[PDB]
């Protein structure tokens, strides 16, 4: 319950990029940190944006993709700017693509999405376990 509060108000900072873009959506979501909500603490996201967008190619299988999701993150007090909680998120998934473009694309964006969505859920779980030692006994 008021570690729930505690989730809720953490408000996710990302720098441009579509694998910050993905991941702010996903946190926000799995945070459920609405929009124009007081803030506690503020979460920097820094994704590797250069290997998030690079699907690579794999042998035995056409058309197999593996992506990496690299995040470095730090949680800030949002009054004072100290950083009271910090980690690291490696998330991999691989996508199968296809000879049409459109399919191809669709493929990709979804692995995207499937990355950031399990590194949300990682990073979630990492802060709910932070925010649950703030709970009394
Ligand atoms: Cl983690």
Known sequence: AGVESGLSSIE???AEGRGGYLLREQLD???AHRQGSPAAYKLYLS???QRFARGVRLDNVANRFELRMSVD???LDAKNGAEVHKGRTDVSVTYDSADQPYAA???Q???QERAAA???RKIQ???ATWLAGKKPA
């Open 29 to 31: 979501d799995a945070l």
């Open 73 to 75: 993150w730090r949680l």
């Open 125 to 127: 779980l990492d802060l």
């Open 47 to 49: 994704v590797n944006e």
């Open 12 to 14: 996710t900072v990302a």
């Open 118 to 120: 399990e590194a949300a």
């Open 109 to 111: 964006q979804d692995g």
């Open 105 to 107: 694309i669709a493929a």
